[PDB]
Scaffold this motif. Structure first.
Motif, mmCIF file in Angstrom:
data_model
loop_
_atom_site.group_PDB
_atom_site.id
_atom_site.type_symbol
_atom_site.label_atom_id
_atom_site.label_comp_id
_atom_site.label_asym_id
_atom_site.label_seq_id
_atom_site.Cartn_x
_atom_site.Cartn_y
_atom_site.Cartn_z
ATOM 1 N N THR D 162 -58.859 53.775 14.776
ATOM 2 C CA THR D 162 -60.155 53.034 15.037
ATOM 3 C C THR D 162 -60.871 53.528 16.154
ATOM 4 O OG1 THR D 162 -60.009 50.838 16.610
ATOM 5 C CG2 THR D 162 -59.065 50.953 14.216
ATOM 6 N N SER D 164 -61.894 56.411 19.255
ATOM 7 C CA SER D 164 -61.635 57.822 19.575
ATOM 8 C C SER D 164 -62.185 58.045 21.031
ATOM 9 C CB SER D 164 -62.614 58.742 18.534
ATOM 10 O OG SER D 164 -62.179 60.069 18.931
ATOM 11 N N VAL E 117 -65.301 55.658 21.422
ATOM 12 C CA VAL E 117 -66.255 55.393 20.477
ATOM 13 C C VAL E 117 -65.565 54.983 19.131
ATOM 14 C CG1 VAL E 117 -68.051 57.092 20.957
ATOM 15 C CG2 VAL E 117 -66.099 58.087 19.645
ATOM 16 N N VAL E 118 -66.199 54.593 18.032
ATOM 17 C CA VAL E 118 -65.649 54.221 16.660
ATOM 18 C C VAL E 118 -66.149 55.008 15.738
ATOM 19 C CG1 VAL E 118 -65.135 52.044 15.331
ATOM 20 C CG2 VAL E 118 -65.610 52.067 17.845
ATOM 21 N N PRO E 119 -65.634 56.134 15.500
ATOM 22 C CA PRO E 119 -65.857 57.092 14.575
ATOM 23 C C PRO E 119 -66.204 56.328 13.002
ATOM 24 C CG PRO E 119 -63.936 57.713 15.353
ATOM 25 C CD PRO E 119 -64.305 56.491 15.955
ATOM 26 N N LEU E 122 -69.717 55.654 13.691
ATOM 27 C CA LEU E 122 -70.563 56.524 14.553
ATOM 28 C C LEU E 122 -71.420 57.158 13.362
ATOM 29 C CD1 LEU E 122 -70.298 56.796 16.939
ATOM 30 C CD2 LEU E 122 -68.588 58.667 16.541
#
Ligand SMILES: [Mg+2]
Ligand SMILES: [Mg+2]
Ligand SMILES: [Mg+2]
Ligand SMILES: [Mg+2]
Ligand SMILES: [Mg+2]
Ligand SMILES: [Mg+2]
Ligand SMILES: [Mg+2]
Ligand SMILES: [Mg+2]
Ligand SMILES: [Mg+2]
Ligand SMILES: [Mg+2]
Ligand SMILES: [Mg+2]
Ligand SMILES: [Mg+2]
Ligand SMILES: [Mg+2]
Ligand SMILES: [Mg+2]
Ligand SMILES: [Mg+2]
Ligand SMILES: [Mg+2]
Ligand SMILES: [Mg+2]
Ligand SMILES: [Mg+2]
Ligand SMILES: [Mg+2]
Ligand SMILES: [Mg+2]
Ligand SMILES: [Mg+2]
Ligand SMILES: [Mg+2]
Ligand SMILES: [Mg+2]
Ligand SMILES: [Mg+2]
Ligand SMILES: [Mg+2]
Ligand SMILES: [Mg+2]
Ligand SMILES: [Mg+2]
Ligand SMILES: [Mg+2]
Ligand SMILES: [Mg+2]
Ligand SMILES: [Mg+2]
Ligand SMILES: [Mg+2]
Ligand SMILES: [Mg+2]
Ligand SMILES: [Mg+2]
Ligand SMILES: [Mg+2]
Ligand SMILES: [Mg+2]
Ligand SMILES: [Mg+2]
Ligand SMILES: [Mg+2]
Ligand SMILES: [Mg+2]
Ligand SMILES: [Mg+2]
Ligand SMILES: [Mg+2]
Ligand SMILES: [Mg+2]
Ligand SMILES: [Mg+2]
Ligand SMILES: [Mg+2]
Ligand SMILES: [Mg+2]
Ligand SMILES: [Mg+2]
Ligand SMILES: [Mg+2]
Ligand SMILES: [Mg+2]
Ligand SMILES: [Mg+2]
Ligand SMILES: [Mg+2]
Ligand SMILES: [Mg+2]
Ligand SMILES: [Mg+2]
Ligand SMILES: [Mg+2]
Ligand SMILES: [Mg+2]
Lengths: 49, 96, 127, 172, 197, 106
Positions: D162, D164, E117-119, E122
């Motif tokens: 979840t 990155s 971040v939260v791909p 995104l």
RNA sequence: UUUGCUCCACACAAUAUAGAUGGAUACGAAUAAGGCGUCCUUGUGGCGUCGCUGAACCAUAGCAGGCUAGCAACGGUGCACUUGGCGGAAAGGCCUUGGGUGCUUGCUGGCGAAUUGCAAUGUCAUUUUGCGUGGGGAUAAAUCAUUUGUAUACGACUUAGA
RNA sequence: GCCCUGAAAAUGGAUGGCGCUCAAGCGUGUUACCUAUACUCUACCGUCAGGGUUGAUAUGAUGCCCUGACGAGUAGGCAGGCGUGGAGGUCAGUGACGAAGCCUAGACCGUAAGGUCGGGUCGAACGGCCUCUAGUGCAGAUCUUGGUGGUAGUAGCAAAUA
RNA sequence: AGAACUGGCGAUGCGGGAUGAACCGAACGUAGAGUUAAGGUGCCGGAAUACACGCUCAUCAGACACCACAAAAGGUGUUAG
RNA sequence: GAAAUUGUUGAAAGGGAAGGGCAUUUGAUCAGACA
């Protein structure tokens, strides 16, 4: 059903609540826009009616 | 907008001093007496405060009060209040 | 000290209280069946109290046993007590509630001699 | 309706005293199992001949495998379909590697472009467009031009957890 | 994974960012979200402006106090999106929410902490390129929010300090690499190559 | 050294449930680092302790434990089902939980 | 109102916990483009290189980590001290100086561990508070009643009183 | 085909809500996955059915033992039971060394009606079993009589000059 | 408002259709384990932010039977014929 | 000398009612079996 005749409402709703104030000294909610090219001075004053 | 510091004068009229109270007569009137000491020591602390107002601060207001005794009224207790100060430049302001 | 028996399994230990017996004092807790026409309880809507029904009935085997394995048998006097003489591994004597203090000590004393268990051996115990 | 196989189906009317050895007819049928295939067969036969399944028999069912399953091919396809207010004939061309893949995307395309479900379609012909320049629909000629090359801009790689710690990049 | 996950709002899709944040809370994961003004919404600015006015007119007819409250700040447009994805009237719900914090900008602690971040939320991975979208900061400032300019100011200032932090760091890892090299081809180094290091 | 952990970190997610009815006899555990049912087929059987604290000391400690075990895998992303000696309290949804390596098979 | 308050130190007791168990590990910006290294004419520049996931990086051996010796290094790190500096968005934290002191698993030695009995979290966190002692420091006010009337149904408000 | 125009109503508001745009939308395909008092297997209750077994010298022949299937339920039928006044029989039943009654988020048996004990209170009578008998079981009937609340220290206690 | 045949509701809970007498699934002794139905699996919420091919951008998009409405007529928006 | 209803004492809970069902934490409380 619908008024019947039309009239303005009574009194202004931008002055609610019609509550006693929190203090005898009403608050300055806003000051003049600042122009820093002029000499320094107050922007208000105190007194008694 | 958020208040950062207040710097106070050294001597304070009883007129203001008594706005800080509700039972003036009975009291030891100790208001601002430790503060007044801050000047003694060369000045150090009051400076850095003035000094820090200068460094940050988007606006400056003055703490002023009425001389209610110069007035025919009965109430001895004066009115103190902040007045924004508009003349130029943050630093020029706090000097004033 | 009783005949060995399978793990006694009680199936629904919680008491079946009357509907709304918790709602108005006038309604006792003792089970009583809803007969009304609209009633949620009689209708079994998810969420309400259960009602007794024959599925809950206990194992033919362990039914009537109290925790110690002994069926309990109410006892008034020694003669009664003695009906348990060939059954100490199966029944236990409960001394009746209205048996006097000095009569309890006779009974208690004889049950000891006979190896017969007593479920309430501290009643009226003049300590 | 599924993943297809193509079937030769052969049937005939039941024999009789006076007419033993009746004629024998074949359809190539595109279905997913032989049970659908046989059924489909009778569906079209009764659209053609005096027969029902009740009074006729299946003689043979055989799956036909693609002849060159790793050769690309330009398919021409003909279809009859039913719309909400009419019925319609139609010609698309599909570019793939087996008739069986071709028919899969046709059915897709019809459902997608024309909202036609399986019940409402009739494949008429599926045949290999032997020499290019008889390829007609542009969305296919597009892929016959010499020394063809193309990028795939804006790469989206799929994250496997979840959070990155980078910040992705669509380079490619 | 970590005791706290700081998410950089910027470049994320509100309702997807919300949907994942909700779950994480509910599963016990503390989260703070930053730069919530640099959040995105699909649909052009005008669409989400119209949507916002829709929301803007629901109120208790007898007393506009008791009625639905309309927060204009980007963090809070956000929080709203979130709260609706959480059973917030249950204790378990209140609990999960207390694990949350949202901020326009990146204020202390977190500005020196790392953000992630939260791909799967995104925008630049999700929105079909071509589609139009909206920035929260601009959306909010058009429905009343007062502090876009002052956040922008504080950020640009923060952004300067951190550019230094970085430059220093890049300088130092250059050295570090040069060391870890004046030591390649040594026995220990070759040994570790063998073991995947 | 600084790590002494001999278990895998884990999370009390929900009870087994429908939309509108839960079943407290089965709990659903998210096992740190397990992403697929295949991945989780490993932990099937491993024992689970939920370790908690109390104010009354007892057998000596102020630390009590609810014990259980993993029993099947649940759904598509490595979540796992487990049963406990006594069902877990439900204030625990979101609490951590310890999965061990015994009974071992390596 | 029977020696009260506050900051620091340990001490005893309670109390609790939405859930420690190696490390939340800091550019920005773009995504039909970038990071890094290098050169230069310093630019929307030349050349090189990388991605295709954090599957990382860092840490990680020693009675939950005991007692001890030496060597090679002059490095790392913990702790309290001290030098200069930075940070006001909620700064309440960051960097730097110098001596001290512990540890070092960088390498090489001596000693210890059992019987917790074949597993049983096997107890190593951090919350709030209460009470003694003693190391710093500090020495008020609000309310009732009385009173004013710029206030008031009652409360409230606003004055005044060594 | 999708989309757009055609498309006007009264408290603010509903694809169930959030929110979603190479969808978390529309058409279609392929897997996997979640979960009903349903299906499969197992234990236990009860109902119905089919077998077996009078042989004493021990205890239920309405019994005991094997086996198979089944279980929704208003109105309504029937059955086996629980409980109360009083009557015949019996246990040479309990009891002033404390009957009966009353209290008790103490114990135990029963699926249940209910039954049993402990402890407190009390003061003169009372129970088990087989039978007989009925003025025999209450939440309602604007039910009967009696007692008690919230309302509430509330409406009010202001005509007739003091 | 009134007939025909069946199946239901009334007399009936349980799962689904958010909600609801009649729709879908399925009819109930007390329980363990398994599997499913109808209906679902971004988050609320158990369950793929799964695979695949197209289509659609709406200054009142659209989003699942019963069901909680829309029509003639138009578009040089875009798609395939 | 029951109940409604009340006072005090002890314990506990309480963000627009309360009460209930399955389940478990926690506190209080208690039977039994062991020898
Ligand atoms: Mg009018
Ligand atoms: Mg006020
Ligand atoms: Mg300050
Ligand atoms: Mg009744
Ligand atoms: Mg009714
Ligand atoms: Mg009815
Ligand atoms: Mg062929
Ligand atoms: Mg808690
Ligand atoms: Mg490059
Ligand atoms: Mg560079
Ligand atoms: Mg360059
Ligand atoms: Mg790295
Ligand atoms: Mg060590
Ligand atoms: Mg903060
Ligand atoms: Mg050693
Ligand atoms: Mg002291
Ligand atoms: Mg709609
Ligand atoms: Mg939805
Ligand atoms: Mg679809
Ligand atoms: Mg069942
Ligand atoms: Mg069965
Ligand atoms: Mg029945
Ligand atoms: Mg009777
Ligand atoms: Mg009688
Ligand atoms: Mg009578
Ligand atoms: Mg007992
Ligand atoms: Mg007694
Ligand atoms: Mg008595
Ligand atoms: Mg008498
Ligand atoms: Mg009789
Ligand atoms: Mg009568
Ligand atoms: Mg009744
Ligand atoms: Mg009555
Ligand atoms: Mg009544
Ligand atoms: Mg009645
Ligand atoms: Mg009455
Ligand atoms: Mg009355
Ligand atoms: Mg009075
Ligand atoms: Mg009065
Ligand atoms: Mg008068
Ligand atoms: Mg009057
Ligand atoms: Mg009727
Ligand atoms: Mg039904
Ligand atoms: Mg339901
Ligand atoms: Mg509906
Ligand atoms: Mg919700
Ligand atoms: Mg889920
Ligand atoms: Mg899958
Ligand atoms: Mg239809
Ligand atoms: Mg039309
Ligand atoms: Mg068109
Ligand atoms: Mg009396
Ligand atoms: Mg309970």
């Amino acid at each position: 059903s619908h008024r019947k005749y039309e009239a303005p409402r009574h009194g202004h709703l931008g002055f609610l609540p019609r509550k006693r104030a929190a203090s005898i000294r009403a608050r300055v909610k806003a000051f003049p826009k600042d122009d820093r090219s002029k000499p320094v001075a107050l922007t208000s004053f105190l007194g008694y009616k | 907008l958020r208040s950062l510091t207040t710097v106070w004068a050294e001597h304070l009229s009883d007129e203001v001093k008594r706005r800080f109270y509700k039972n003036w007569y009975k009291s030891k009137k100790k208001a601002f007496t430790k503060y007044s000491a801050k000047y003694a020591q060369d000045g150090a602390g009051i400076e850095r405060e003035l000094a820090r107002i200068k460094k940050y601060a988007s606006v400056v207001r003055v703490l002023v009060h009425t001389q209610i005794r110069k007035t025919p009224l009965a109430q001895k207790k004066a009115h103190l209040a902040e007045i924004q100060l508009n003349g130029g430049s943050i630093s020029e302001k706090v000097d004033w | 000290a009783s005949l060995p028996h399978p793990k006694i399994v009680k199936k629904h230990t919680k008491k079946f209280k009357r509907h709304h017996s918790d709602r108005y004092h006038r309604v006792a807790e003792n089970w009583r069946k809803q007969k009304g026409i609209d009633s949620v309880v009689r209708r079994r809507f998810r969420g309400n109290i259960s009602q007794p029904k024959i599925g809950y009935g206990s194992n033919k085997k362990t039914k009537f046993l109290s925790p110690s394995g002994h069926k309990t048998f109410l006892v008034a006097n020694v003669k009664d007590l003695e009906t348990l003489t060939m059954h100490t591994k199966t029944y236990a004597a409960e001394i009746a509630h209205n048996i006097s203090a000095k009569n309890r000590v006779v009974i208690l004393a004889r049950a000891k001699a006979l190896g017969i268990k007593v479920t309430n051996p501290k009643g009226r115990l003049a300590l | 309706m599924a993943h297809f196989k193509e079937y030769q189906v052969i049937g005939r009317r039941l024999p009789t005293e006076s007419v033993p050895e009746p004629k024998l007819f074949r359809m190539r049928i595109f279905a997913s199992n032989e049970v659908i295939a046989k059924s489909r067969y009778w569906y079209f036969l009764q659209k053609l001949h005096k027969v029902k399944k009740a009074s006729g028999e299946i003689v043979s069912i055989n799956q036909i495998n693609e002849a060159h399953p790793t050769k690309v091919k330009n398919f021409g396809v003909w279809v009859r379909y039913d719309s909400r207010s009419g019925t319609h004939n139609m010609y698309k061309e599909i570019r793939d590697v087996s008739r069986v893949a071709a028919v899969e995307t046709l059915y897709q395309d019809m459902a997608a472009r024309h909202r036609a479900r399986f019940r409402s379609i009739h494949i008429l012909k599926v045949a290999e467009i032997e020499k290019t320049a008889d390829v007609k629909r542009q969305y296919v000629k597009q892929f016959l031009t010499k020394d063809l090359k193309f990028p795939l801009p804006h790469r989206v790689q799929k994250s496997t957890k979840t959070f990155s710690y980078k910040r992705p990049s669509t380079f490619y | 994974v970590e005791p706290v996950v700081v998410i950089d709002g910027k470049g994320h899709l509100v309702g997807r960012l919300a949907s994942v944040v909700a779950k994480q809370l509910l599963n016990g994961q503390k989260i703070v979200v930053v730069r919530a003004e640099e959040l995105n919404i699909s649909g052009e600015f005008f669409r989400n402006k119209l949507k916002y006015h829709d929301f803007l007119r629901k109120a208790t007819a007898f007393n506009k106090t008791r009625g639905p409250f309309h927060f204009r700040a980007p963090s809070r447009i956000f929080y709203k999106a979130l709260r609706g994805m959480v059973s917030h009237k249950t204790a378990r719900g209140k609990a999960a929410l207390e694990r949350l914090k949202v901020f326009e900008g990146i204020p202390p602690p977190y500005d020196k902490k790392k953000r992630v971040v939260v791909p799967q939320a995104l925008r630049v991975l999700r929105l079909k390129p071509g589609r139009k979208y909206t920035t929260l900061g601009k959306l909010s400032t058009s429905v009343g929010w007062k502090y876009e300019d002052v956040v922008a100011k504080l950020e640009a200032k923060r952004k300067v300090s951190s550019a230094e932090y970085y430059a220093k760091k890049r300088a130092f890892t250059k050295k570090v690499a040069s060391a870890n090299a004046t030591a390649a081809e040594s026995d220990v180094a070759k040994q570790l190559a063998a073991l995947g290091y | 050294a600084e790590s002494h952990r001999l278990y895998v970190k884990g999370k009390h997610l929900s009870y087994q449930r429908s939309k509108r009815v839960n079943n407290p006899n089965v709990s659903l555990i998210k096992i740190e680092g397990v992403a697929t049912p295949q991945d989780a087929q490993f932990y099937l059987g491993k024992r689970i302790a939920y370790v908690y604290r109390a104010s009354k000391e007892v057998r000596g400690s102020k630390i009590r434990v609810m014990w259980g075990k993993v029993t099947r895998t649940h759904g598509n992303s490595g979540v796992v089902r487990a049963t406990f000696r006594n069902n877990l309290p439900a204030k625990t949804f979101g609490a951590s939980v310890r999965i061990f390596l015994y009974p071992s098979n390596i």
